[model samples]
Target: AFPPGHFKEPKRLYCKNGGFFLRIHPDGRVDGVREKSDPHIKLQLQAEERGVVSIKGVIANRYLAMKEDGRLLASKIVTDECFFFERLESNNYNTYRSRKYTSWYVALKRTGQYKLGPKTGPGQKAILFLPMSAK
Candidate 1:
């Protein structure tokens, strides 16, 4: 197990900050999601192969594709490189900003699972947990 504050700064080690979106090709070594060869959310592809590739690849892209908003979709990735990127027109431009999670213990103490995605409207402020059996 990690020390008390093993990962004090998750942003420094995890997120790239700001926002990001991957430009994957028809390759398996990409994000490694079910839809690896499928057309990405923000990518264009042949009409014949619209959203029909590999779920695994899609998952990989989801897990790796960082959006403009502060969010990460990395769930079933098969690459060690947390993420991939493309160069920008500006030399000093950054593809993604970094994200930092509050203290782990605090987060767990407050909410067991890591909450993500949009958190707007009263409906969004709900928790769905399934506790273990008391057997």
Candidate 2:
């Protein structure tokens, strides 16, 4: 378990599969884009518990959430579906598994599209992310 206030800083998650940044748009759309200059990609990780967090888009002010079938979306309200367990892998990458659905992970496609959590795994590059400073 992580200490309280461990992840108070804002960061950008760079997806390994497409070399893209996780983007959360204003309309609740969650996707990935290669441009590092986009403001929509900036995210703030708010700790919900020891290892869980609710990711919010700094620009859109929406929470990164997952649906029952694993579809990802940006939500206006914080709910159980909005929390994810942050895990750091051996390869120096991070993976976010849904807190509500333990087996599902936040993932991206090779073409910069959002991949459903059910299609992701810790061993897959699509689910690997390099969490870097937003600045």
The most accurate candidate by TM-score is: 2
TM-score of each: 0.17, 0.94
lDDT of 2 at 44: 90
How accurate locally is residue 73 in candidate 1, as Cα lDDT from 0 to 100? 41
- Model 1, 1-100: lDDT tens per residue? 1232312221111111211123233332222112223344232211112221111223224333333342334435433222332212233322221122
Model 1 error, position 9 (Å)? 16
| Per-residue lDDT of model 2, residues 55-97, tens digit only | 9999999999999999999999998999998988889888899
lDDT, candidates in the order shown: 0.23, 0.89
Total backbone collisions, model 1:
23
Clashing pairs in 2: none
